């Protein structure tokens, strides 16, 4: 565990506005890229405000496909559900979050991230690997709209990993009015060896809005997001 004294533990670290730093290195069908992100989260309200920049030039996949990859510790857990907040309970030492995201009739992303505090800053460091994509598909062919939908994210305990398993589906809007499904399988494990909250089944409700910074000339994405735990009582 940590130093007992460690001024703040788990939930205590998220009572106020916390700065966020996101770092992603990716490789999709050999198209290599990096993204950095910065902003803050206010878990009391489930609120995230973040700006992401492709630091290597043009992003070789659509921004919306990276949203789920690019800090569920910022979810607003109702008081009556506080005993189910795995994500906060793993802090400050943090957790590893792993996903496989299947893009229907296209390739897959496999992601590994470590989410933890570095001082006052909540850091999400991510490696993304994408294979089996079509060069002319909705992803490498850039055929997705720059927008996002609301979703529910379904959580259950994985007692064998002292962690959780998570799953959900994202539907990205295609420019022709159709829909590109991205099925998400996820697992999270604590980095530290201390006790974590292993939750009953529940879900997080998401709202996400994407926009552009009128003064930003690099390839980028502005994200406003609200996340709320629900499903128990």
From Swiss-Prot:
Tissue specificity remark: Photocytes.
Recorded consequence of changing residue 82 to R: In Topaz; shifts the major emission and exitation peak up to 20 nm
GO biological process: bioluminescence; generation of precursor metabolites and energy
Listed result of changing residue 166 to A: In GFPB; leads to enhanced fluorescence at 37 degrees Celsius
Effect noted on mutating residue 148 to C: In mut1.9; shifts fluorescence lifetime from 3.03 to 2.74 ns
UniProt effect for mutating residue 102 to S: In alphaGFP/cycle 3 GFP; improves folding at 37 degrees Celsius, reduces aggregation at high concentrations, and increases the diffusibility of the protein inside cells
Practical uses of the protein: Green fluorescent protein has been engineered to produce a vast number of variously colored mutants, fusion proteins, and biosensors. Further generation of mutants led to more stable proteins (at 37 degrees Celsius for example) with brighter fluorescence and longer fluorescence lifetimes.
Effect on the protein of changing residue 149 to I: In ECFP; leads to cyan fluorescence, folds faster and more efficiently at 37 degrees Celsius and has superior solubility and brightness
Impact reported for residue 72 to M: In Citrinine; leads to excitation and emission peaks of 516 and 529 nm, respectively
Recorded consequence of changing residue 151 to D: In Cerulean; leads to improved quantum yield, a higher extinction coefficient and is 2.5-fold brighter than ECFP
Consequence of changing residue 71 to L: In EYFP; leads to yellow fluorescence, folds faster and more efficiently at 37 degrees Celsius and has superior solubility and brightness
Outcome of mutating residue 83 to R: In Azurite; shifts the excitation and emission spectra to shorter wavelengths and increases quantum yields compared to BFP
Keywords: Chromophore, Luminescence, Photoprotein
Effect of residue 148 to H: In mut1.3; shifts fluorescence lifetime from 3.03 to 2.78 ns. In mut1.5; shifts fluorescence lifetime from 3.03 to 2.72 ns. In mut1.27; shifts fluorescence lifetime from 3.03 to 2.85 ns
Mod. after translation: Contains a chromophore consisting of modified amino acid residues. Maturation of the chromophore requires nothing other than molecular oxygen.
Disulfide topology: none
Result of changing residue 170 to T: In P11; increases fluorescence at 475 nm excitation and at warmer temperatures such as 37 degrees Celsius. In Esmerald; leads to brighter fluorescence. In VisGreen; leads to brighter fluorescence
Presence of the UniProt keyword Membrane in the record: no
Function according to Swiss-Prot or TrEMBL: Energy-transfer acceptor. Its role is to transduce the blue chemiluminescence of the protein aequorin into green fluorescent light by energy transfer. Fluoresces in vivo upon receiving energy from the Ca(2+)-activated photoprotein aequorin.
Subunit structure and binding partners: Monomer.
Family recorded in the similarity comment: Belongs to the GFP family.
Protein name: Green fluorescent protein
Species of provenance: Aequorea victoria
């Amino acid at each position: 565990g940590i130093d007992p004294f460690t001024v703040s533990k788990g939930e205590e670290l998220f009572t106020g506005v916390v700065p966020i730093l996101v770092e992603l290195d990716g490789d999709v069908n050999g198209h290599k890229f990096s993204v950095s992100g910065e902003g803050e989260g206010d878990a009391t309200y489930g609120k995230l405000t973040l700006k992401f920049i492709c630091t290597t030039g043009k992003l070789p996949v659509p921004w919306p496909t990276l949203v789920t990859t690019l800090v569920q510790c910022f979810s607003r857990y109702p008081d009556h559900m506080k005993q189910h907040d795995f994500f906060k309970s793993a802090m400050p030492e943090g957790y590893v979050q792993e996903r496989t995201i299947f893009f229907k009739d296209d390739g897959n992303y496999k992601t590994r991230a470590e989410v933890k505090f570095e001082g006052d800053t909540l850091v999400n460091r991510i490696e993304l690997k994408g294979i089996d994509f079509k060069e002319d598909g909705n992803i490498l062919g850039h055929k997705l709209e720059y927008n996002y939908n609301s979703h529910n994210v379904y959580i259950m305990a994985d007692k064998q990993k002292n962690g959780i398993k998570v799953n959900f589906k994202i539907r990205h809007n295609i420019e022709d009015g159709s829909v590109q499904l991205a099925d998400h399988y996820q697992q999270n494990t604590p980095i530290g060896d201390g006790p974590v909250l292993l939750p009953d089944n529940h879900y997080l409700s998401y709202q996400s809005a994407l926009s552009k910074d009128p003064n930003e000339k690099r390839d980028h994405m502005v994200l406003l997001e609200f996340v709320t735990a629900a499903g128990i009582t």
